[PDB]
Symmetry: none
Subunit: 59 residues, 5 copies
């Protein structure tokens, strides 16, 4: 049993990003996720998330 | 049992980022996630998250 | 049982970042996460998070 | 049982960062996380976090 | 049972950082974390955190 000589899993490569000008405003009362950039994940025998917003959980 | 000579898992490579000018404002009353950049994760036999916002949990 | 000669897991490589000017403001009453940059994690037999905001937990 | 000749886990490499000018303001009443940069973690048989904000816990 | 000739776990390498000018202000009434830079952690059979803010815990 073998796995590949060059194996790439959950990978980000070679990202550029420019904001030559920007305005951003957020208002929140009682979830916000913003700007999440160049992100890499691997999960094994368990769940994964990368930008998760839940406003509220009630039980 | 073998795993690959060059194996890459949950990897970020070669990121550039410029803000030549920026304004950002946040207001929050009672979750905000912002600017999360160039992030790498691996998890094994357990869950993962990278930008998680929950406004509130109530039980 | 063998694991790869060059094995990379949960890795950040080669990040550049410039703010040639910036303004940032935050106001919070009763969670905020900002600017999280160039971050690497591995977890084994246990959970992971990297930018987690919970406004409040109540029980 | 063997693990790789060059094995890298939870690693940050080669980060540059410039603020040629910046203003930042924070106001908080009753959690804020900011500027978290170039961070590396590994955890084994136990959980991990890197930028975690909880506004309050009540029980 | 063997572990790799060059093994790197929870490592930061080769960080540069400049603030050619900066202003920062914080106001807090009743948690703030800022500027956390170039940080490396490993934990075994126990939990880990690197920038953790809890506004208050009440029981």
């Amino acid at each position: 049993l073998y796995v590949g000589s060059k194996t790439k899993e959950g990978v980000v490569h070679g990202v550029a990003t420019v904001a030559e000008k920007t305005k951003e405003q957020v208002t929140n009362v009682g979830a916000v996720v913003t700007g999440v950039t160049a992100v890499a994940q691997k999960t094994v025998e368990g769940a994964g998330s990368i930008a998760a917003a839940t406003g509220f959980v009630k039980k």
